[PDB]
Design an enzyme around this catalytic site. Structure first.
Site, mmCIF file in Angstrom:
data_model
loop_
_atom_site.group_PDB
_atom_site.id
_atom_site.type_symbol
_atom_site.label_atom_id
_atom_site.label_comp_id
_atom_site.label_asym_id
_atom_site.label_seq_id
_atom_site.Cartn_x
_atom_site.Cartn_y
_atom_site.Cartn_z
ATOM 1 N N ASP A 1 -22.667 -13.575 -17.807
ATOM 2 C CA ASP A 1 -21.390 -13.872 -18.463
ATOM 3 C C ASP A 1 -20.334 -14.372 -17.443
ATOM 4 O OD1 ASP A 1 -18.816 -11.715 -20.017
ATOM 5 O OD2 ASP A 1 -19.055 -13.963 -20.023
ATOM 6 N N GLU B 1 -15.656 -11.591 13.261
ATOM 7 C CA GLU B 1 -15.655 -10.178 13.696
ATOM 8 C C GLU B 1 -14.719 -9.387 12.748
ATOM 9 O OE1 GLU B 1 -13.844 -10.081 17.932
ATOM 10 O OE2 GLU B 1 -13.681 -12.277 17.526
ATOM 11 N N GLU C 1 -13.032 -6.440 11.574
ATOM 12 C CA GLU C 1 -12.664 -5.032 11.807
ATOM 13 C C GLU C 1 -12.539 -4.258 10.511
ATOM 14 O OE1 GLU C 1 -9.233 -6.544 13.851
ATOM 15 O OE2 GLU C 1 -10.048 -6.302 15.859
ATOM 16 N N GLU D 1 -11.728 0.614 17.998
ATOM 17 C CA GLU D 1 -10.853 -0.544 18.096
ATOM 18 C C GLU D 1 -9.461 0.068 18.226
ATOM 19 O OE1 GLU D 1 -10.716 -4.482 18.209
ATOM 20 O OE2 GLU D 1 -8.790 -3.546 18.150
ATOM 21 N N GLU E 1 -15.047 -1.769 15.139
ATOM 22 C CA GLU E 1 -15.569 -3.093 15.156
ATOM 23 C C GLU E 1 -17.060 -3.048 15.459
ATOM 24 O OE1 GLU E 1 -14.649 -7.235 17.436
ATOM 25 O OE2 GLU E 1 -13.085 -5.794 16.787
ATOM 26 N N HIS F 1 -11.251 -12.329 12.757
ATOM 27 C CA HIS F 1 -11.146 -13.483 13.656
ATOM 28 C C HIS F 1 -12.265 -14.439 13.416
ATOM 29 C CE1 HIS F 1 -9.069 -10.658 16.694
ATOM 30 N NE2 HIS F 1 -8.286 -11.003 15.689
ATOM 31 N N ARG G 1 -3.850 -13.260 23.350
ATOM 32 C CA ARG G 1 -4.089 -12.626 22.053
ATOM 33 C C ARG G 1 -2.805 -12.583 21.192
ATOM 34 N NH1 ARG G 1 -9.544 -10.808 22.391
ATOM 35 N NH2 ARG G 1 -9.906 -10.471 24.612
ATOM 36 N N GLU H 1 -11.015 -19.731 18.464
ATOM 37 C CA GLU H 1 -10.917 -18.484 17.715
ATOM 38 C C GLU H 1 -9.624 -18.523 16.910
ATOM 39 O OE1 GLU H 1 -11.255 -13.859 19.106
ATOM 40 O OE2 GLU H 1 -9.368 -14.860 19.461
ATOM 41 N N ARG I 1 -7.185 -16.630 14.743
ATOM 42 C CA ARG I 1 -7.040 -15.194 14.515
ATOM 43 C C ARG I 1 -6.230 -14.867 13.295
ATOM 44 N NH1 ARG I 1 -5.772 -11.812 17.701
ATOM 45 N NH2 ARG I 1 -7.066 -11.292 19.449
HETATM 46 N N1 LIG Z 1 -20.269 -21.468 19.905
HETATM 47 C C1 LIG Z 1 -19.856 -20.432 19.126
HETATM 48 N N2 LIG Z 1 -19.301 -20.700 17.908
HETATM 49 C C2 LIG Z 1 -18.823 -19.742 17.096
HETATM 50 N N3 LIG Z 1 -18.854 -18.425 17.431
HETATM 51 C C3 LIG Z 1 -19.365 -18.021 18.626
HETATM 52 C C4 LIG Z 1 -19.928 -19.006 19.554
HETATM 53 N N4 LIG Z 1 -20.311 -18.296 20.633
HETATM 54 C C5 LIG Z 1 -20.059 -16.983 20.405
HETATM 55 N N5 LIG Z 1 -19.482 -16.834 19.206
HETATM 56 C C6 LIG Z 1 -19.111 -15.594 18.495
HETATM 57 O O1 LIG Z 1 -17.745 -15.278 18.574
HETATM 58 C C7 LIG Z 1 -17.636 -13.904 18.295
HETATM 59 C C8 LIG Z 1 -16.947 -13.330 19.513
HETATM 60 O O2 LIG Z 1 -16.854 -11.958 19.278
HETATM 61 P P1 LIG Z 1 -16.312 -10.954 20.364
HETATM 62 O O3 LIG Z 1 -17.351 -11.033 21.429
HETATM 63 O O4 LIG Z 1 -15.966 -9.682 19.603
HETATM 64 O O5 LIG Z 1 -15.025 -11.779 20.809
HETATM 65 P P2 LIG Z 1 -13.643 -11.293 21.420
HETATM 66 O O6 LIG Z 1 -13.754 -11.803 22.836
HETATM 67 O O7 LIG Z 1 -12.649 -11.840 20.439
HETATM 68 O O8 LIG Z 1 -13.545 -9.830 21.468
HETATM 69 C C9 LIG Z 1 -19.053 -13.339 18.173
HETATM 70 O O9 LIG Z 1 -19.470 -13.271 16.799
HETATM 71 C C10 LIG Z 1 -19.910 -14.351 18.882
HETATM 72 O O10 LIG Z 1 -21.255 -14.353 18.364
HETATM 73 C C1 LIG Z 2 -8.190 -5.590 20.018
HETATM 74 S S1 LIG Z 2 -8.044 -7.450 19.367
HETATM 75 O O1 LIG Z 2 -6.905 -8.640 19.840
HETATM 76 C C2 LIG Z 2 -7.168 -6.373 18.020
HETATM 77 C C3 LIG Z 2 -6.894 -7.464 16.988
HETATM 78 C C4 LIG Z 2 -6.127 -7.041 15.722
HETATM 79 N N1 LIG Z 2 -7.029 -6.195 14.978
HETATM 80 C C5 LIG Z 2 -5.691 -8.094 14.696
HETATM 81 O O2 LIG Z 2 -6.187 -9.249 14.750
HETATM 82 O O3 LIG Z 2 -4.887 -7.858 13.705
HETATM 83 N N2 LIG Z 2 -9.365 -8.110 18.684
HETATM 84 P P1 LIG Z 2 -10.458 -8.832 19.667
HETATM 85 O O4 LIG Z 2 -10.183 -8.426 21.152
HETATM 86 O O5 LIG Z 2 -11.828 -8.488 19.209
HETATM 87 O O6 LIG Z 2 -10.286 -10.303 19.503
HETATM 88 MG MG LIG Z 3 -11.746 -11.517 18.518
HETATM 89 MG MG LIG Z 4 -14.104 -8.522 19.425
HETATM 90 MG MG LIG Z 5 -11.355 -6.681 17.762
#
Ligand SMILES: Nc1ncnc2c1ncn2[C@@H]1O[C@H](COP(=O)(O)OP(=O)(O)O)[C@@H](O)[C@H]1O
Ligand SMILES: C[S@](=O)(CC[C@H](N)C(=O)O)=NP(=O)(O)O
Ligand SMILES: [Mg+2]
Ligand SMILES: [Mg+2]
Ligand SMILES: [Mg+2]
Ligand SMILES: Nc1ncnc2c1ncn2[C@@H]1O[C@H](COP(=O)(O)OP(=O)(O)O)[C@@H](O)[C@H]1O
Ligand SMILES: Nc1ncnc2c1ncn2[C@@H]1O[C@H](COP(=O)(O)OP(=O)(O)O)[C@@H](O)[C@H]1O
Ligand SMILES: C[S@](=O)(CC[C@H](N)C(=O)O)=NP(=O)(O)O
Ligand SMILES: [Mg+2]
Ligand SMILES: [Mg+2]
Ligand SMILES: [Mg+2]
Ligand SMILES: [Mg+2]
Ligand SMILES: [Mg+2]
Lengths: 443, 443, 222
Positions: free
Chosen positions: B52, B131, B133, B188, B195, B244, B315, B332, B334
């Site tokens: 539906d 990622e 959270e 986190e 996370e 993010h 950040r 990234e 955010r």
């Molecule tokens: N070329 C890429 N394109 C998109 N995402 C990627 C690439 N390389 C790594 N990542 C991803 O980006 C994310 C980074 O996460 P994390 O290591 O928590 O980052 P941060 O440094 O924000 O804490 C992970 O899911 C990782 O697999």
């Molecule tokens: C510790 S942080 O900058 C915390 C991020 C926050 N939760 C927010 O984006 O609102 N995240 P990350 O280092 O994984 O990119």
């Molecule tokens: Mg991040």
């Molecule tokens: Mg992270």
């Molecule tokens: Mg984080």
């Protein structure tokens, strides 16, 4: 001049006034006061009593705190509820700086300035008839407010259903003893809602009276175990409280709004005035509706204005012209709420309506309809404009308008906007339980 | 080319799968599913299973409700926690009309279409690394969540202070077994916040993962008597949750974003792409932050974006460029939060990115500081624009952008605005406890 | 008839009426009223006191909500339970449009019309003897009604068994001071049920009495 120094010195003796209160209004409209033994009457009637201006919202700053109180002899009134322990007479006061000059941030003084512009247009009186609605809530066992309405009655309901009848009757007794001229009292539409009405007076005296009324309502309500609140929309789903402003101009001691032989019996002057209110409506809403909560009342279906338009005998627009004529011909502005600083709401409504008159503006076609039910497309076809939808939206319209900004003056306008920006910001960053109910399990 | 009908029929038999779940996503991002015994596998693999569509948020209307489900073979996955009482395999599905054509309102289908515009510009794939959270709240004796956070730990905290190692440990076990490449796990920044990171994949597989991820977290959390939530900002004063979005474009199977001989080793495509994001940022925010509560996270001081700018290893801006280069060079974004619909967020971010590259737009100078501690003056002088501050502002911005509006398609666009306009109207007319604490006594 | 404008003006003085209640009835039969100080007496007697007609069931719409009140001088009655703090007199009113013409949805006015059809057929009086019975329930600490009857008595029962004897005794006394001719008072068949009876009168006066009785009953039970 009603009273003279000599009258006040003799009234105090022959009435046995033991204490004097010097009162004034802050920028948010809150009554403020200090009490002095009647032995300090000379000090106060000499404009010598001082206070800390950096502790009153929107006044001076801490480095230049000293401020002075100059009592207005014509506002002398005795508070009946104090007579048995120590009789109290009040004076409303104007704020002066230490160097003898009036404070330009005193809301009451500003209203007087806009009233002088009126005198130069040839008019000699600006009458205001305010109708400020309020709710009553039950106190708990610790004397604190709860969320239980005092009753579940409705418009013009009689007792058992209306339980505010005694409290209202006790409010009317104190006001009548205080010289107020009471016209009517009743249960209003929502549960625990009420209204007491009283005769219109000149702009300044009428704001003084709005201030005294809010005071006497909250005090007496507390003796009956209740908590009175003039908050605009304390509960979602039912009516909010309004503070309708019935406005009229007199010229030569005659209602300049009445014309015996004219369309709707409204003179050209009344029509230009309405043209003014209409033009600056969306612009002065921030002042007439200064709290975040205010915008929760401005939603259709609750007999509150949410669209700028005028009409005769119609309780859905921004301006109703009641069926009364002759000396009672009046423009009722239904947007103002009882959280407004009465002194500043009149300043901005006077300036708007004086703009329309001095530039003979043309009033729009009245909308003789239930504006709430008329569709989007249809009201833009009639040029019907929506009022601001939030306090932040209203502040932005207010800033954009020179004649309204001039209506407050630099000090008032700078302080008013800063205080409202802080408030809006707090509100907007709070996470409300609503959000948690909506998203905490859904996401 | 991961699985064929024969693979699936074989796996189902060898793994002894006993039920099949056919899942899809609605316009809000909410996972939906029906379950069928494995004897009906053939009916499902013939795209004959119906539902539906009038009862799914954002789809079709009651008089045309019959809709069909077409399993995508490559999303086959066994849910391990169901194997003890009756083993369950799932399939993500595409929504079709009863004439045989794809449904224009199906979010996943829509991401496919924007991806075809990515192919037309010459890119092999669009990789997403999510990622998202989440917070853990304690359940009560009725199995209902309370506001007690599971612990009062902080970033990278160790057990006893971190009381979430148990649960995450089990989440990771389910995920590892369902085929996720898990990368890290930790407490986190905020109390009770967690996370669990996992390898990027191609946009469509990445959005399927996010859906499967939120599903597994909430389930395993319930087994530890916890309630997991992806609400953006469950509590005022502490961090919100983000989702993010690590973006990147590949070409010939190589990261198009890396250029070791360039400045910051960021290629031209990257730079153009980032220019696309920055341009449409204030416009796609309604999509990537689709709830009222989303805007309570989008305040300065919490490592969430506030202001449209970008920077390396920072950040505080809207776009951070992480230190890693080579195959890991990524942009990234955010602002996205875990309440976003993953398909529509990708669709609008890709569209914006691809506008940047198509018209080769010039990226802004990176703002290499803490945007939070910049004055109003500084920001203006740098051309730093603010993100929309409420869901209502974001909607207005979104509407006036043809390229974003077109990224959604007609049906989705029209149904999105309708749902969020409704949602916003409920929120604005609501009278919150805050308003009473602030005003009920003051006025 | 009964009273002229000048009679009323004089009565108001000798009795020291402090407030006037203007009352009327909505379409559901529920009495409604507004209170004004005695100094506004001349305004009310001039048919000048207004109200929001859209806020009353079965009346006008909000686009044309202003509406006027025209007190019937013959319905002047003082409420004894109010003298102690602010003596009140009520007037029952007819509803008028702002143009001077009577409101066609006013139930009391419509009854006057059917009474004119009676006159032109030769009759001079339509009398009514209403017997409106009622139950009494126990309130709680929060003055809210519970479903506990005031007693478990039956028809014509005597005290201990009938526990509404004092309530209906006080009611009967209020009515008698307000000019009612009470005829009988007793406990009725059902538990917690009571009847008070009063002499018939002209149809309009008698409908005015029913609305007055319901009010005085609910007030004294409380
Ligand atoms: N070329 C890429 N394109 C998109 N995402 C990627 C690439 N390389 C790594 N990542 C991803 O980006 C994310 C980074 O996460 P994390 O290591 O928590 O980052 P941060 O440094 O924000 O804490 C992970 O899911 C990782 O697999
Ligand atoms: C510790 S942080 O900058 C915390 C991020 C926050 N939760 C927010 O984006 O609102 N995240 P990350 O280092 O994984 O990119
Ligand atoms: Mg991040
Ligand atoms: Mg992270
Ligand atoms: Mg984080
Ligand atoms: N000429 C006038 N100028 C200003 N106010 C007036 C004038 N004549 C009457 N009023 C006031 O208008 C207010 C109307 O209150 P109310 O009678 O409650 O109005 P409504 O008919 O809106 O319910 C009263 O305070 C009344 O004194
Ligand atoms: N001629 C009459 N017209 C209308 N009512 C009358 C007439 N004579 C008496 N009545 C009324 O009829 C009602 C009869 O009430 P009650 O004595 O309770 O009767 P019952 O015998 O039904 O108990 C009383 O209000 C009484 O005043
Ligand atoms: C019942 S009403 O039309 C109710 C008005 C409403 N309380 C408001 O202004 O929000 N007030 P009034 O008839 O006194 O002008
Ligand atoms: Mg009124
Ligand atoms: Mg009112
Ligand atoms: Mg009014
Ligand atoms: Mg009988
Ligand atoms: Mg009987």
């Amino acid at each position: 001049a009603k009273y003279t120094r000599e009258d006040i010195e003799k009234l105090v003796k022959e009435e046995n006034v033991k204490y004097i209160r010097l009162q004034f209004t802050d920028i948010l409209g809150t009554i403020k006061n200090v009490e002095i033994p009647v032995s300090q009457l000379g000090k106060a009637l000499d404009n010598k009593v001082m206070f800390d201006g950096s502790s009153i919202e929107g006044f001076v700053r801490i480095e230049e705190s000293d401020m002075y109180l100059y009592p207005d002899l014509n506002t002398f009134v005795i508070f009946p509820w104090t007579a048995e322990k120590g009789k109290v007479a009040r004076f409303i006061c104007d704020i002066y700086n230490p160097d003898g000059t009036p404070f330009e941030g005193d809301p009451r003084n500003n209203l007087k300035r806009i009233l002088k512009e009126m005198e130069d247009l040839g008019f000699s009186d600006f009458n205001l008839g305010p109708e400020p609605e309020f709710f009553l809530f039950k106190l708990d066992e610790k004397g604190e407010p709860t969320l239980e309405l005092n009753d579940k009655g409705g418009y013009f309901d009689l007792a058992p259903t209306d339980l505010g009848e005694n409290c209202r009757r006790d409010i009317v007794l104190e006001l009548e003893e205080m010289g107020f001229e009471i016209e009517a009292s009743h249960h209003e539409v929502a549960p625990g809602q009420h209204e007491i009405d009283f005769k219109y007076a000149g702009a300044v005296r009428s704001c003084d009276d709005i201030q005294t009324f809010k005071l006497v309502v909250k005090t007496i309500a507390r003796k009956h175990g209740l908590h009175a609140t003039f908050m605009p929309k304390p509960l979602f789903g039912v009516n909010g409280s309004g503070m309708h402003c019935n406005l009229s101009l007199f010229k030569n001691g005659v209602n300049a709004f009445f014309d015996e032989n004219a369309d709707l019996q409204l003179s050209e002057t009344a029509k230009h005035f309405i043209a003014g209110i209409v033009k600056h409506a969306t612009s002065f809403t921030a002042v007439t509706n200064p709290t975040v909560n205010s915008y929760k009342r401005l939603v259709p279906g609750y007999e509150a204005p949410c669209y700028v338009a005028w009409s005769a005998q119609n309780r859905s627009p921004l301006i109703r012209i009641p069926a009364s004529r002759g000396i009672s011909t009046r423009v009722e502005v239904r947007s103002v709420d009882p959280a407004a600083n009465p002194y500043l709401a009149l300043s901005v409504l006077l300036a708007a309506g004086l703009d329309g008159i001095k530039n003979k503006l043309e009033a729009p076609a009245p909308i003789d309809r239930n504006i709430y039910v008329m569709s989007k497309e249809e009201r833009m076809e009639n040029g019907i404009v929506d009022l601001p939808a939030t306090l932040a939206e209203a502040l932005e319209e207010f800033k954009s308008n020179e004649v309204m900004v001039k209506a407050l003056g630099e000090h008032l306008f700078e302080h008013f906007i800063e205080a409202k920006e802080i408030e809006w910001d707090m509100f907007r960053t709070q996470v409300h339980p609503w959000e948690r109910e909506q998203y905490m399990s859904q996401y």
